[PDB]
Amino acid sequence: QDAKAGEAVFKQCMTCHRADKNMVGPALAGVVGRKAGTAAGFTYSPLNHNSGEAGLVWTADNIVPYLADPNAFLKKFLTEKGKADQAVGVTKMTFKLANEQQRKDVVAYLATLK
Numbered sequence: 187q188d189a190k191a192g193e194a195v196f197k198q199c200m201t202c203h204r205a206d207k208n209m210v211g212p213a214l215a216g217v218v219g220r221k222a223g224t225a226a227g228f229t230y231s232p233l234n235h236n237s238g239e240a241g242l243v244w245t246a247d248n249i250v251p252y253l254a255d256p257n258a259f260l261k262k263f264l265t266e267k268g269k270a271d272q273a274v275g276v277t278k279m280t281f282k283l284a285n286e287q288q289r290k291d292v293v294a295y296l297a298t299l300k
């Protein structure tokens with residue numbers, strides 16, 4: 187949860203993500219508190235879109251486990267909601283971050299991206 191230390195982790199996210207514009211991935215400014223699959227102008231996968239449609243809002247707490255394994259997180263979310271059939275595909279985000287402290291720091295960084 188050290189946002190300054192999260193800057194260095196955020197350099198990897200900048201391959202695909204900017205704060206205000208879409209690129210390979212959606213724009214991330216305001217992502218903490220945003221309904222999944224809704225950055226204006228971004229075309230999301232069905233797995234991410236259906237997760238937000240089922241109510242998923244990204245928070246400082248749930249982005250941490252998400253970053254360890256995006257597919258697993260989103261599948262488990264829709265399964266828990268009784269919507270396992272909507273989680274058969276995969277996300278466009280092919281990156282994963284294993285280290286828990288790095289995930290917590292980068293999420294503290296994201297929370298400052300207003």
Ligand code: HEC
Nearest residue numbers: 198199201202210211212222223230231234277278279281
């Ligand atoms: C390119 C290889 C990426 C890397 C590096 C990072 N992300 Fe990503 N992210 C990528 C895509 C293509 C998408 C769209 C996913 C889909 O299935 O449509 C995403 C999505 C996210 C999200 C969800 C955003 C939303 O629902 O609006 C988050 C919270 C996210 N990505 C965070 C994130 C972080 C913090 C990264 C660095 C640690 C990171 N991503 C790397 C592509 C890529």
